[PDB]
């Protein structure tokens, strides 16, 4: 499987520009429900990023377990925080806004200059046997299907009790 052609980078840039505005809406808007809806938009436009790259399961699942359950749960939660419409006008809060918008940008600069010095397209040639197998005849719901249970046995056996404990704790806490 593969992609159409030079239409690729078009959708890439489009989704990137959508996701940037989505994140800015998540972090800027004061009305929390608008923030949650913009978060849902961010997550669907990142599910589309997952789907563009030929990884299908980790896209559709991510769309089902987040753009579904988690967002409606958060919407239900925002029905418990009262009092909105705080101050505004260019870092509404204290100087902590400026201090953050400084340190975060330093973090950016660091990682964003570390990355464009590693030849990723050269780190792909040195591994020409990893993605050269495909097991002989497999599709990409059986790859995960088997390789989840043939060697990832212990964490799969583990996650269930984590889920159960989280359920029990959530019910015991939320209930008065």
């Amino acid at each position: 499987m593969d992609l159409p052609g030079p239409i690729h980078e078009i959708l890439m840039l489009f989704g990137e520009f959508i996701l940037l505005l989505g994140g800015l809406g998540v972090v800027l808007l004061t009305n929390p429900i608008y923030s949650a809806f913009s978060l849902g938009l961010v997550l669907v436009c990142i599910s589309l990023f997952y789907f563009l790259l030929n990884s299908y399961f980790v896209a559709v699942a991510q769309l089902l377990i987040y753009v579904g359950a988690i967002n409606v749960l958060i919407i239900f939660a925002v029905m418990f925080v009262n009092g909105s419409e705080w101050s505004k006008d260019k870092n509404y809060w204290t100087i902590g806004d400026g201090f953050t918008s400084l340190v975060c940008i330093t973090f950016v600069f660091s990682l964003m200059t570390t990355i464009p010095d590693t030849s990723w397209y050269g780190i792909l040639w040195t591994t020409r046997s990893n993605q050269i197998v495909e097991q002989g005849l497999i599709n990409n719901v059986q790859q995960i299907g088997i390789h989840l249970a043939t060697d990832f046995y212990l964490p799969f056996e583990l996650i269930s009790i984590i889920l159960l404990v989280s359920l029990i704790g959530a019910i015991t806490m939320a209930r008065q």
Partner: protein
């Protein structure tokens, strides 16, 4: 030379079949609303939408065109920031599901080995749009009117999943075409609805509330406040909501028949329709139209069953609906899988 791209300017995609599907689904929406307005209000009543020509064959698109103008109002509290954004998610959640739905022998739009999984994933995006729409305004009768439906919808996808999986484990696939492949063996013995009727019951009862049936229990009783979160939505907005409702109904019927029944299989196995004559000449258009034929009728049967059930039970209140969806359907929809595990153990 080949400066940027020779054959890759725009000539790799055609938008003919997609528009054909659009025309077909719109026509089928007209057919199903005609079915409703001519059978539901005609059991012991007068005829349905007469005077719109011979019969209401033009009445449906007439209501569509009327709703088209209807001066969309856009109330003050809440605006285009979320108002126009609301029904878009609703309509797309069911429109995109038409991808993996087949219609006949080699008429699928995309193989998409994660097909039914994609359908289940896209079925659980509507509640987001419903909550958004119901909250796009400010007053009540839309906030709680949408909250009720968005909440009760969440209480049913789990039986949907534990009935779709009890068929995926039988067909050993996730693409509809392979599902109907594993079902065209014995004509109608091999049909999964007989092999797993306990799952079909759960799927059918869940499908009702999953496509908002019923959203209001009575022709006089409202959709639990004054209306189902579509009060201020006057023109094309209520039109799109009417659409998305009918389309959820359609997709549910098509999926239950393509899963538990032979998709485009006759009552005699689908391959057997060729061998007993020793030769075929022009079976192409015959099999195409007969795949549209033998499939759409099976879903029509469920359309009619739902239409009848509409006038036989008082749809429960959302004090009993949650109880039924949680403490009744979940245990049996788990037990059928627990059974079919050892059943498919061989």
């Amino acid at each position: 030379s080949k400066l940027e791209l020779l054959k890759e300017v725009y000539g790799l995609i055609s938008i003919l079949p997609i528009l054909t599907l659009l025309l077909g689904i719109t026509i089928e929406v007209l057919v199903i609303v005609w079915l409703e307005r001519e059978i539901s209000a005609s059991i012991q009543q007068r005829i349905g939408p007469e005077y719109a020509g011979p019969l209401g064959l033009l009445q449906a698109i007439a209501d569509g065109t009327k709703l088209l103008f209807k001066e969309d109002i856009l109330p003050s509290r809440g605006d285009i920031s979320l108002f126009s954004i609301g029904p878009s998610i609703a309509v797309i959640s069911v429109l995109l599901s038409f991808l993996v739905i087949p219609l006949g022998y080699h008429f699928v739009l995309a193989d998409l080995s994660i097909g039914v999984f994609l359908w289940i994933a896209i079925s659980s995006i509507a509640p987001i749009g419903l909550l958004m729409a119901g909250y796009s305004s400010n007053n009540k009768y839309s906030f709680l009117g949408g909250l009720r439906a968005a909440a009760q919808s969440i209480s049913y996808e789990i039986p949907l999943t534990f009935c779709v999986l009890a068929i995926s484990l039988l067909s050993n696939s996730l693409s509809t075409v392979d599902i109907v492949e594993a079902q065209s063996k014995y004509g109608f013995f091999g049909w999964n609805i007989w092999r797993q009727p306990i799952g079909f019951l759960v799927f059918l009862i869940s499908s009702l509330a999953e496509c908002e049936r019923l959203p209001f229990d009575l022709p006089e009783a409202e959709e639990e406040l004054v209306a189902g979160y579509q009060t201020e939505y006057s023109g094309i907005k209520y039109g799109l909501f009417y659409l998305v409702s009918y389309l959820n109904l359609l997709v549910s019927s098509l999926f239950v028949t393509v899963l538990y029944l032979g998709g485009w299989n006759f009552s005699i196995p689908y391959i057997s329709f060729f061998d007993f004559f020793q030769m075929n000449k022009a079976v192409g258009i015959l099999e195409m139209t007969m795949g549209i034929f033998i499939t759409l009728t099976k879903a029509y049967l469920f359309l009619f069953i739902s239409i009848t059930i509409r006038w036989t039970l008082p749809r429960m209140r959302m004090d009993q609906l949650l109880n039924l969806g949680w403490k009744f359907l979940l245990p049996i929809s788990l037990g059928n899988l627990l059974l079919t595990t050892s059943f498919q153990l061989v």
